[PDB]
Amino acid sequence: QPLLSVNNLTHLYAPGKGFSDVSFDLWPGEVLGIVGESGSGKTTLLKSISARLTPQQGEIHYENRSLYAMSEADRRRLLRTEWGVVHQHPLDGLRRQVSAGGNIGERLMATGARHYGDIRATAQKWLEEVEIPANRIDDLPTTFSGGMQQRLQIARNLVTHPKLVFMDEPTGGLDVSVQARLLDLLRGLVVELNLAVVIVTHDLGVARLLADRLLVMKQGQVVESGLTDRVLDDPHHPYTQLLVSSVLQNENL
Amino acid sequence: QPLLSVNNLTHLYAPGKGFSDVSFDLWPGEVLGIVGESGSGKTTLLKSISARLTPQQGEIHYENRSLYAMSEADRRRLLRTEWGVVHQHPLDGLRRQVSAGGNIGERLMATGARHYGDIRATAQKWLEEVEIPANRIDDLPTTFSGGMQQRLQIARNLVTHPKLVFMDEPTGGLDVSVQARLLDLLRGLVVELNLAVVIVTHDLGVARLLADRLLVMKQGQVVESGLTDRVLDDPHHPYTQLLVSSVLQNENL
Amino acid sequence: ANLSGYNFAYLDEQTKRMIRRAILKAVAIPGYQVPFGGREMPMPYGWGTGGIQLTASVIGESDVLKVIDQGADDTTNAVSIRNFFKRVTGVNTTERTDDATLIQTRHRIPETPLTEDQIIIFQVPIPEPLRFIEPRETETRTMHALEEYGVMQVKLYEDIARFGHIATTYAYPVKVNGRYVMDPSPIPKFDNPKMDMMPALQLFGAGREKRIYAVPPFTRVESLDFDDHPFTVQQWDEPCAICGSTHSYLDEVVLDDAGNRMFVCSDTDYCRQQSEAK
Amino acid sequence: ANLSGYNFAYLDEQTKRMIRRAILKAVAIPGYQVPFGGREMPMPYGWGTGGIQLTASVIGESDVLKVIDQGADDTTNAVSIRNFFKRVTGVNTTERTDDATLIQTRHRIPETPLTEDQIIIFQVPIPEPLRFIEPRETETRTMHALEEYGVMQVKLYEDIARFGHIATTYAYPVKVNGRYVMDPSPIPKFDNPKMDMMPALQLFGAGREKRIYAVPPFTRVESLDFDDHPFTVQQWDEPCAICGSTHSYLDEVVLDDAGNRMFVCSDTDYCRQQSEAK
Amino acid sequence: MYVAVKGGEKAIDAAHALQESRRRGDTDLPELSVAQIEQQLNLAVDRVMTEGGIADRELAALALKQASGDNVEAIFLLRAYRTTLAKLAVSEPLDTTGMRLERRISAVYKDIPGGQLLGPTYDYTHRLLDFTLLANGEAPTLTTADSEQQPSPHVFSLLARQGLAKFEEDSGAQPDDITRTPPVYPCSRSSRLQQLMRGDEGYLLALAYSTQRGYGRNHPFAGEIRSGYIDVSIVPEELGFAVNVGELLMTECEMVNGFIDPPDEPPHFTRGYGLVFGMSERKAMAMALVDRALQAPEYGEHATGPAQDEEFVLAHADNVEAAGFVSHLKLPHYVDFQAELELLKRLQQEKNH
Amino acid sequence: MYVAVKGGEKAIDAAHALQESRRRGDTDLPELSVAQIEQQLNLAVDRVMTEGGIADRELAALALKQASGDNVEAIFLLRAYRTTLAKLAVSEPLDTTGMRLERRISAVYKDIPGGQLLGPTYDYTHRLLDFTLLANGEAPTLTTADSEQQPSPHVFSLLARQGLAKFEEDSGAQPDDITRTPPVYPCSRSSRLQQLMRGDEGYLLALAYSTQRGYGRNHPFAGEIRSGYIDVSIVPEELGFAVNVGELLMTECEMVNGFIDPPDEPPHFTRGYGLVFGMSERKAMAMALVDRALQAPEYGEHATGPAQDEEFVLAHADNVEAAGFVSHLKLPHYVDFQAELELLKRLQQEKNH
């Protein structure tokens, strides 16, 4: 049975703004990439399926429990201990006045961790995992660069080894080397720990290397979906063809 | 003579945070790319050379006038009428409580525009230039997606046809199609109007297609510089080699 | 004469001299809000203390003082201020604009054009034209220093986009001498044109906010507007019910509970002149 | 007896009944701040009104009331509250903890262990343990509802990272019955252990903030801490200068301007018992 | 060795005796009478009534006398006395159109039906200390005009009939009573107004002033201020029909505020309301201004000042609470402070290691 | 047709006569004496002196009498009277260690050198309305103890000698004078304290209370509150040596605030300071609390409450300004309101088109 099941999900701020009639499944150890036009409803959908925006229509089932039929307490418990959420703007997923170490350790303590030294050591290890120097642990995120904030948010949302991570453009602000580090980290987590990921991205290379399936969104509607390689290499919808044709081609020397 | 001349520029928050001893020239109708590790000092340098951060050492000359020896009034006049600045976080370059039309029209009115209808028409034309529907003119940027905010910021900073535009990761949050639209727009402005651009980017494809020269920054130091194609295809510094090797390769069907 | 036990014009000489230096600086820097160490008056802050201090620092024994509020000499506060000045100076007073050497006003410029050697002193609550856009002095001071007036232009453009018109109807901001954005005091837009290239010296006092500024004679004062939304003054469908004038700012007098009203000149001296002409 | 012209315990029966319903709800929901329609007392808000109202709503004619402030019965406010209750109830009063049926306290739990049928009533300024992290009730209410206690854990961890220790020294937050994070009132951390599995019923009143909460007898109360930074109580290098006790919370009495001081038990009844034993 | 001694009760009694003697002052002077305070310090009495919650001039004057003129202490005295009294009735809603006017002014029109009635006011006085009051004097013999009270319709009624403002309609909603249930944020407008009426005059004045200076501007005009006697009526269960129990001197302030342009109705002025006991007006004006500021959620207004922050304003408005909690610092805090000192000494020792 | 008539002057005179008659009240009662207000309403006098800027009890009582007990109007009367007087001297700095104590308490230690001297206070009284004050009574015959004043060193001196707090050092900086130059934000601590001393009691109390409730917490303990007589000395140019011109009754409050851990010194308590004329304390306490709150820029503190917003607090603290500007809405505003009306009518017509 699917870890997450989305049926006829709809949320529209206005006639065209948001998403309408979105359905998909997700299982453990799988990545659902979401690509499409800027302003197509990807962030809105990610919020809705991550218990942050009540849909107007449709249902979300997590482990065969309707997401928005649950109590608010249960949803917050899921978002504290079970799920991870990486926001498009990194600071939206961080505590500005809390050090990086504290930002990471909040999640660990939410899972019952109560040893300060172990929490700090894990935070430093995860800072080194995302190539943030461990000597920045006590610095506030406001002193971090955009990419550093992004990586801190990722580390904060991955430290508890969640069963399901929603990510909005996680590679934003990352250099290609640290981007590759992050892709390897996520792939390893998915394959080993059976982590499931829903990743919104505009980098079709990241989608190709990471996403097991893809959803192409235009004007709030999923216009194409299926195997990532099939969608990117054999697009059927005109918009998907335009998107793949707009990719910046590289050359091999 | 160079439009912008940077000599021995240095600004360090701490021993390693920021940039140190940076020198380069820029001329009209040219694009200086800045690439490097997240947290290497690119945003700090861009702020310093854009009259937003006083350097500790070195000099910046704009049209043969020292930038920080000028009055604050002159620097603000440059940033109002002469220059454009695109921030890494789009909202930092936008007025949250001002409509998109107002965000664009502020710059026009700063250049002496005083016809409301013409200002609104130009704002709509530039919204269509960045593929934002013209019917979003009266909506606040808070209702915009991240990429929409990015494109609104770009339109706001390009509407006055500035002689020099500093951009921090302008393609962040943009789909590949609208990214290509933006690249064509910037290239056309550079070639026709002799616009000069200093663009920080992590997408080496954008740098290759847009930048005439590159600076590569690691830990606040320019470790490599020169012709874009030479830097990317014949890197000498180990970090540049690592960066180019980390690029996500694509395939042609 | 002054026979009340107070110094002439009620201010000590030190305060007069400080205010006079402030006036001279304001004149030399048109539109710029000159801070000054204003003092508490017998009138509460917000009831005209700045204008009172300016008049006390400029007035002499031979001056003919005119005090108006809402364009009328008989207004309560106008009567109070004028009686105070009669007590502490003994100067001659008039309701006739053309005979006044000093005119202290609240929210009106007289319809009768001012002339050389006349000084008109405005009572100003908020001397900062950017205050309602930016409540903090720490920011508006810098904006005036750097001529960073974009928030005002954005306010005007957003007003047009929202309502189709500029929302401000009184205290309408004006550019003075091509440089300084200045608050003209809460006069209606109707009066702003009179400030442009006027033979009289205009002084502006904000006692509570501790500012003095000035527009010298024959100085450009241009209301901020747009070519397709040009500065337009208040209009009424009716003339003055008393003198019949169609060229004056009108005040609406509610006559009965059944909605019957009339409109009469705010400038009572102008109204009297018009009524005597006919 | 009650011979002052006021109802017994000074509260009208409606207020007593409302407070009693609040007490019962608080008992059924340990650690949860029960709002209640508290009234203004003869003591100012912030001088113990919540404890006064609780005691007035629970006290009877056969109760033996003990009132302490800073652990001392003779403290000014303790004397005031106790005299008020003697006036409006006539109940017997004691300074001896073991003879008290009701103990109203400010900032101390007595060293003498409490016993069954005893009720200890705490005066609480801030009933919300998250208030200094989150000043707004609109947020702390939801955080308690959803058990969203992360800001508190983050505060503790940041305190350790900054100073090497948790900065809170009194009103140290405690988890009650495994669920509710509760403010134990401004008692020093020294007293927090006494709250765990205590035979007496603990009541907490915040009159100004309009809250009542409770810890029933034999309920788990665990101070928030870390394994490597375990909950530690205040310690002193000196014993009590009077009774010689090393197991009591000490207050520092400054004796002279030359830095000479002494330390004496805050719990004056415990100090008297110890002094009589020796 | 040192032995504890009892000093609390006798020190407290001596302190209270000292305060009572200071209150009496020089016995060569006659003791002030509560009637004198009620008559000649009537504005202080107005404030004490409004903020103490009881509109009994004699009780407010008594509290002022007992408080040595301390308005805060007197307000607390009256508020506490309220707790000892039973609620014998709830009045029928006041009808301010029936007020017998002592004063009625409007800033929005030069002249209005019923006229500008200045009444007893310090407005337009020259605030020069009147040293003749250092000795007994003669009050002016008042001049007299016609005795008839002209019709004085509310200015907002004239605004609303033109469509410039919206009538305040009564849907029959049951008012919230913060004296029986603690406030729950966000509070209804009825609860907010009840709290504002009880709020500190100075705090609310400063908040309104900040709103006038751009921190949450509401573009206010004093549409109407009335001060006069309003009849109070109840419906006792014994008789079942309304009885007039007397009249109260009250001041009512209606402020015109910033107009709005709602999606589906003509643009119109907003409005604020203030109501206080007695003649003192500035409390009513500040109450109306802050009421409009706290109306922000209704109008979807983006807050630009603390006056629009409902919890910050209302939670700290009641000076009974604020004065009590600020004064409580005078209470012994040495256990707490010892807990602080122990931590600080350990921190210093660790840093100096 | 309608003709204009003169009504302003006579209406104003009648209004002022009405106010004077109301101030006198019932002539059967004896007229209040300024001496009576000074003696028996001494806390109101304390507030009027502190906020009006003149420490002259008789003048404050006169203002209160003239203001009909309106503390705001009396404060403005005294403040305005200040403008008519010449500055004959500037005092040497006050030395509060020389105060002759009426009252001295400390919350941070149970007992201190010099003892807890409660003095005349309403603290620990049961606020029950004393109806015996409705008639003449007898003040208590005060009990007497030893007449010697024990040494009462400042508690902060004892804190600083231990290294727990920092001595307030004098570098000789020239104080700013907001009575001669308008404030320039950010203001020095001297200017901020001068403004706080003149600030509205209720506003500052509410701000301090909000700080106690987490809106910019400063962890305050009432380190010491003293009330007593302090000598004033000057150095006249005529003689060139110091002369004692008398003594003033003043209250001083020193608050211990939350400790800090600076990079290169031992951690120590911060502190706040309050100083007022007379016995009323809560103004001094609130002044110290808000002074500490406004010390945020010095300590690099991230603001969490309006009490830390310097411009918002200080620009609206003076009740002379705030009351004046709020009351000014009572002034005729019909020209501006007519402009507003014209715009609104045009907007309505355009929407309804």
Ligand SMILES: Nc1ncnc2c1ncn2[C@@H]1O[C@H](COP(=O)(O)OP(=O)(O)O)[C@@H](O)[C@H]1O
């Ligand atoms: N709060 C809001 N109010 C109105 N419209 C909104 C709001 N938030 C987002 N939108 C609109 O909804 C659409 C979807 O936004 P979003 O899901 O963020 O796009 P993207 O897929 O680029 O993340 C956009 O066109 C945006 O303008």
Ligand SMILES: Nc1ncnc2c1ncn2[C@@H]1O[C@H](COP(=O)(O)OP(=O)(O)O)[C@@H](O)[C@H]1O
């Ligand atoms: N306000 C600040 N205080 C201290 N350090 C800072 C501050 N802002 C940036 N830094 C540090 O300076 C370095 C350069 O940052 P930045 O120029 O933003 O990097 P990038 O090149 O990724 O944009 C980073 O390592 C960052 O942590």
Ligand SMILES: O=P(O)(O)OC[C@H]1O[C@@H]2OP(=O)(O)O[C@@H]2[C@@H]1O
């Ligand atoms: O600060 P002051 O004392 O100099 O008063 C200036 C102005 O402030 C008030 O506002 P207003 O424009 O309505 O008229 C009043 C007065 O004229």
Ligand SMILES: O=P(O)(O)OC[C@H]1O[C@@H]2OP(=O)(O)O[C@@H]2[C@@H]1O
């Ligand atoms: O709100 P109340 O009236 O019930 O008073 C509760 C507490 O608030 C104050 O703070 P505190 O803990 O120092 O002691 C005082 C008092 O006991």
Ligand SMILES: [Mg+2]
């Ligand atoms: Mg998005």
Ligand SMILES: [Mg+2]
């Ligand atoms: Mg950057």
Ligand SMILES: [Zn+2]
């Ligand atoms: Zn006319």
Ligand SMILES: [Zn+2]
């Ligand atoms: Zn002992």
Ligand SMILES: [Zn+2]
């Ligand atoms: Zn306390």
Ligand SMILES: [Zn+2]
């Ligand atoms: Zn006004």
